[PDB]
Amino acid sequence: TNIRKSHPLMKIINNAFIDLPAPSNISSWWNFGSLLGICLILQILTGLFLAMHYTSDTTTAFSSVTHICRDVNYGWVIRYLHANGASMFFICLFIHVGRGLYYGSYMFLETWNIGVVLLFTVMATAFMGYVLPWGQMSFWGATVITNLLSAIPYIGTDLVEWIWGGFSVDKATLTRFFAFHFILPFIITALAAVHLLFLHETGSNNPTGISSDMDKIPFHPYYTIKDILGALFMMLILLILVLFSPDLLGDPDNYTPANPLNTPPHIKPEWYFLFAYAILRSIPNKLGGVLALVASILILILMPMLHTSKQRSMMFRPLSQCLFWMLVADLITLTWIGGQPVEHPFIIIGQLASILYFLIILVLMPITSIIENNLLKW
Amino acid sequence: IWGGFSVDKATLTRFFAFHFILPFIITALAAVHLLFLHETGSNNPTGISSDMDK
Amino acid sequence: TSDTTTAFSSVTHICRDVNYGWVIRYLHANGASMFFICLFIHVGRGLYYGSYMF
Amino acid sequence: TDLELHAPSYPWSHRGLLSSLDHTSIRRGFQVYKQVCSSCHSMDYVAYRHLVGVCYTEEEAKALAEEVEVQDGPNEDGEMFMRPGKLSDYFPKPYPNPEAARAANNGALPPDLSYIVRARHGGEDYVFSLLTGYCEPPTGVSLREGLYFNPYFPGQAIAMAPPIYNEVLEFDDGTPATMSQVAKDVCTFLRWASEPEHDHRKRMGLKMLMMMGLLLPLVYAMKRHKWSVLKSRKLAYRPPK
Amino acid sequence: GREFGHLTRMRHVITYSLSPFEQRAFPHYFTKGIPNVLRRTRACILRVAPPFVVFYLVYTWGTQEFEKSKRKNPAAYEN
Amino acid sequence: SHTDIRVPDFSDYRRAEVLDSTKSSKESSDAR
Amino acid sequence: AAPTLTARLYSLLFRRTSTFALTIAVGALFFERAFDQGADAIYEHINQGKLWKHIKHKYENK
Amino acid sequence: AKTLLHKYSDIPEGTECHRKAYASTSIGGATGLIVSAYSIALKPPASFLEGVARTGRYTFTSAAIGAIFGLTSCISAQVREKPDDPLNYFIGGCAGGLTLGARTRSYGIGAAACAYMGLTAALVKMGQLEGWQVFAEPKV
Amino acid sequence: AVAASSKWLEGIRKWYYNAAGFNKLGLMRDDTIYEDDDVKEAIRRLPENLYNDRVFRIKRALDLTMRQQILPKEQWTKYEEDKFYLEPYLKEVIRERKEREEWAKK
Amino acid sequence: MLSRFLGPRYRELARNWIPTASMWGAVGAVGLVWATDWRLILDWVPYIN
Amino acid sequence: DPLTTVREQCEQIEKCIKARERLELCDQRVSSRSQTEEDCTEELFDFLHARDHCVAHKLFNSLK
Ligand SMILES: CCCCCCCCCCCCCCCCC[C@@H](O)O[C@H](CO[C@H](O)CCCCCCCCCCCCCCC)COP(=O)(O)OCC[N+](C)(C)C
C-alpha cells in the first residue's frame, strides 16, 4: 500500500534522503558536506567529458590538451570546470573538516575515520590528476614529490623505482598515474556511501552540539530545498570564478610543455598542498620531513582521544575556540610560508608554526579543556 | 558517438573511457541485484519453496 | 593507451614490451567469453527453474 | 640570487571585468605576426582556424592561408611538396627542428607564442614590458656578446635582438607604426592567441550573472517560504500538576 | 529503526504553526535582523579578528623585512 | 487544561490581505 | 476586495499541475528568446566598437 | 619624551605599516598612563586592585586607539597611494573614534568621537604640511 | 591550598560563566554535558517532573538558534539559579563505573 | 584514566597470552620472509637455493 | 617615441630624478674601480620600478 515503504530500495532512500530525521537548528556549515556531495559528481562527469580526449602518453598528451582548450565545442568550459571545480572541491572540503572538528562531529568515531581515509584518498587523486595535464610543474613536481619516499632507509627508494616503471617520468609513469587517478574517485564514492551509512545510524550532529533527538525534523520538506539553495550559490562561486577568473586559481608553468631538460625557477606545488609542502621545509633530514608530512594528516585521529572538554562542540567555549583560531591561523601561516620561495626567516617562522601546530592539540587543547572543566565542576 | 563524422581517434577515445567506466556501473547494479534478492529468499531445483529447509 | 597513432603499437607494447603483458592480455581476452560461459548458462538456468518468479 | 625586475601592471582595455578584447588591435597585431613575427618561436598549436571568425571571411581566411605553405606529406610515392594554402593548414613550421633555432640562437630556444601570456607571471603585460625593456647595462656588470641586456629577462640579458624598432612594419590598414602602438598590437594579438575563446567567454559569463541574480533571490524566497513554518512557531509548556 | 515513530519521551509541549500561504515570506525581514547581525558581530569579532590581524601583520612583516634583505643588498654587500 | 490554552498573536507574521479578523480566507486563497 | 488579476490567474493555470507545467513550458520558451536576444543586443551595445561584426564593413560586399 | 614623538615622526611616508603602528601604539600607551595617573590621583579608587583595574582600562584603551589609528593611516597611505593629502589620516581619525566607541559600548560617544577625532587628525596632518607653529618661538 | 584568593576565582568563573553562551540561552550547565551512554543512563534516572523541564528548555533553545535570535535579556540565567540536579546521578555513575572496573582489575 | 588496565588480572592476561603473541608474530615474520622474497632471512636458512 | 616621450615625462617627476641621481651614484661607486664588486644594476632596477610605476598610468594616455 505505502509506496515509499513498498519497494525496499525506496525503503532505504526513505530511511535517508527522503525523510531521515534531522536536527532543525542546522546552519550552512552542515550544508557544506552536502556541497562536497554536490561537487563530486560534477567533477566526475566533467572528467568524463575530459576523458574523451586526453591521452596518457609522454608525448601525445599535451597536444590533446590543446585539442581540448581550442578544438572542443565549449570543452574549455569543461576543462576549467574540472580544474577550478576540483579547486572548489578542496575549498568546501576544508570548511567541512573545520566543521567536523569544530562542532565535534568527530565524536562519531568510525564515521570520522572513514572521513580520514576518504581524505587521504582525495589527496592522492589530487596529486596524480595534477600530474596528468603534462607540463613543467607536472613533470618536475611529480618527480620531486615522488622523490620523498626515497627517504626510507631501504624500501622507499626501491618503491619510487617501482612507481615510475622506469628510470624517470615517462609514458610508463604517466599512464600509471592516469590509471590510479581514474580508479580512486570511484572508490571515493563507495567510501562516501559507507560514510553516510555510518552517519544515519548514529544520528546527525547539531550546531548546539548537545543532542537534539527531541527536536528531530523531517528532511525532505526542509533541508532538501536548503541544500539546493546552497548548491546553487556554490554554482555562483564556481561559475564566477571560471567565466571571470579563468586562470588565476592554479600555477602557470604547466602551460609550458614539460622538459626533463629545461628546469623551472621555483616549482611551487599547487596551493592546497602548500602547507604540507611547507612542512617539507620544516626540519633537517628528509626522512623526518616525510614523517611529519604524513603526521600532519594522521594527527587528526588523536583528537577524539585528545578531546575531553564536556562540549561535544566548540561554540559555547570561546576559550578553546581561541586556541582553535590560533590553530587555523597557524594553518594560514604554513600556507603562505609554503607559497613563497625558500628563505631563512620563512624557515624559522615555519619551524615554530609547525611545533605550535602540533602542540595546540597535543598540549594546549586537552589541558585547557581540563582547567575549563575545573572552573565549572566538570 | 563518433564525436564527428568519421571513425577516429576521438571515437576510440570515447569507447575507451566509456569501456573504462561502464563496468563500475555494472558492479553497482549487480550489488543492487543482490539487494533485490535478499529478503525474497533463493530458489530450489524442485520448484517448491524450501521455506522449511533453508 | 591509444589515439589513432598509439593504438596497436601500444597493444603490442603490452604483448611484448610490458612485463608479463602477453600474460594479462591473453587472460583478459579469454576472460571475456569465459565470463559469458558463466553468463548465458546462468541466464539459461534462470529461464529454466523459474527463478524469475522473483 | 639576483632579482628579476617586477613589471608594473598597466591598464589595458580588456582588463575591465566587463571588458572584451577588440578584433582591431588583434588584427593589426596579426599583421605584426604575418611578417616580422616569423623569427620563431612558434604558434603551431593554432592553425588558420580561429582566424576566420575574428576578422576573416572563409575565402579570405584561405586567402590569408596561402600566403605561406607548409609541406604536403608524401602520397602514393610523390613525397614532399607544397600545398597552396587552405586555412586548415597550420602556421609555418618555425624550423625543421628547434635545435636548428638553438644553433641559430646560442642554444637558447625561442619559446612558442601560444602560452607565453598564460605561462609567464605578469603575463601579457610582461610580454609588452620585455619588448620595451632594453635598458643599457650599468657599469661593472658582465654580458655575453650575443646578449642584449634587458632587466625584464630574469637573467637580465636576453639573447634576443630587439625585433621592434621605430616604424617596424607599415600596416595594410595604413595606421602609424610607433614601437609602442605596434607592440600593443603585438601583445593584444598574443592575448588573442593566448585565449581564443575570451571575447566569446565574457558574453557567456555576463549572461550567467543575470541568471544567477534572478535565481539567487527567488530560490531563497522559497527557502523562506518553507522554513517560515518553523521560524514562526510558538511553543508552550503546561505542567499537568 | 530510529525513525520518529519511537523516540525520546516528551510531554505536554505544544506547537503553534501557520500555513505558509497565509503568511508573507518576509515579516520585517530587514529591520529585525540587522541588530541581530550586528550583535552577533560584536559578540565574535573579539574572538575572530586577532588571529587574522596577527597573520596579516606577520605577512607584511616577513615580506617587507626580507624584501629589505633583498632589494637593499648592493649597499649591504658594500663596494 | 484544554481551557486555558490559547493561540498567541501571529498578525505581524500574517499577510496584509488576511491581516484582519473579519474577511474571508477563501477570498484571499487565489491571490495568495 | 475584488480579486486581483493575479488572483483569478491562480484559479487558472496554477491550481492544476498540468497547466502549471504548461505555463512553465511556454514561459521557458519566451524567457529563452527574449532574454537571449536581450543579452545579445545589450552586449552588442555596451563595449561598442570592440565588435568586428560592425567592423565587417572593411571587408564585405566589396 | 620628545624623542619618542620624534621616533614616530620619521614615518617615512607610510612605508612599513607595522613600524609606524608600533610607535602610535606607544604614544597612545603613554597618554593612557598619564590620564590614569591623574585619575587615580584625583579620584581615590579605594582598594588598590580596583585602581590597577582602572589604569589597565585607560591604558589599554588609549594604546588600542593609537594602534588602530596608526595602522589604518599607513595602510590608507599604502593603498590609496595618494599619499600625502590630509584626508589620508582622516579615515584613521574616523576609525579611532570607533575604537573608542567599542570600549564604551555606546553608539553615541563612538559617533561623536569619530567626527572630532577625525577632524583633529586631519588638522594635524595639514599642520605638518604647513609648518604651523602651535608654540611659536618668541621671534617677534 | 587556595582560600583567600578564592573570591577572585569566583570573580572569573562568573566571567567564565559569562564566557560560555549557555546563559544567554539560559540552559542548565547539566544540559550542556555530552551524552555518552552511561550519563545517558543517568538521564534515565531522572524524575519526570525534572525531566520534561529539561526537555522543554532544550527545545526552546533549539528553536532560538534556528532563528539565531537570542533568548530575551530579562530571562538570562543567574549563576546561583542553575540547579545542578544531575550531580547525584553522574557521581554515582562514576562511582559505579570505577566500581566494576575496581573489581575488574583484580 | 588509563590506570584501569593497570591491574594484576590484566598483567596476568599479559603473562598468559604473551607466548601466543610471539607465535603469531613469528608466523607473520615468516610470511614476510616468504611472500616478499625477503632474501635476508631466506639467507639465514641454508635450504634455500 | 611618444612612448619614450612619456617615459621622460615620468622622469620629470622628482621620483625619477632622485632615482636618477642615486643611479649615477651607485653606478659611479662601481665605476670608481675596475675591482668593484657591486651590482649597481640592481639600483637600475630600483630606478625602473618607480619609473614605470609612473609610466603605469600614463603609457596608455599615448593611445592613438
Ligand atoms: C550536482 C552538481 C551541481 C548541479 C547543478 C544544477 C543546479 C540546479 C539547481 C536549480 C534549482 C531547481 C529548483 C527546483 C524547482 C522546484 C522545487 C520544488 O520544491 O518545487 C515543487 C514543485 O515542482 C514543480 O512545480 C514542478 C515543475 C515541473 C517542471 C519540470 C521540468 C522538466 C525538465 C525536463 C528536462 C528536459 C531536458 C532533457 C534533456 C535530455 C514543490 O511543489 P510546491 O512547492 O508544493 O508547488 C506546486 C504545488 N502544486 C502542484 C499544487 C502546484
Ligand code: HEC
Ligand atoms: C633575435 C632573433 C629573434 C627575433 C628577431 C625575434 N625572436 Fe623573440 N626571441 C628569440 C630568442 C632566441 C628569445 C629568447 C632568448 C633567450 O631567452 O636567451 C626570444 C625571446 C622573446 C620573448 C620572451 C621570451 C622570454 O623567455 O622572456 C618574447 C616575448 C619575444 N621574443 C617576442 C618576439 C616574437 C613573437 C618575435 C617574432 C618571432 C620576436 N620576438 C622576434 C628569437 C627571436
Ligand code: HEM
Ligand atoms: C566528498 C566526500 C564526503 C562526503 C559525501 C561526506 C558526507 C559529508 C557530508 C554529506 C556530511 C554530512 C553532513 C551534511 O553534509 O549535511 C559529512 C558526513 C560527515 N562527514 Fe564527511 N563526507 C565526505 C569527506 C569527509 C572528510 C574528508 C571528513 C573529515 C574527517 C569528513 C567528516 C564527516 C563528519 C564528521 C560527518 C557527519 C556529519 C555531521 O555530524 O555533521 N567527511 N561529510
Ligand code: HEM
Ligand atoms: C575529486 C577527485 C578528482 C581530482 C582531485 C581530480 C584532479 C581533477 C583536477 C584537479 C583536474 C586537473 C585539471 C588540471 O590540473 O588542469 C582533473 C585532473 C584530471 N582529471 Fe580528475 N580528478 C578527480 C576525479 C576525476 C574523474 C572521476 C575523472 C573522469 C571521469 C577525471 C578525468 C581528469 C582528467 C582528464 C584530468 C587532466 C585534465 C587536464 O589535463 O587538465 N577526474 N580532475
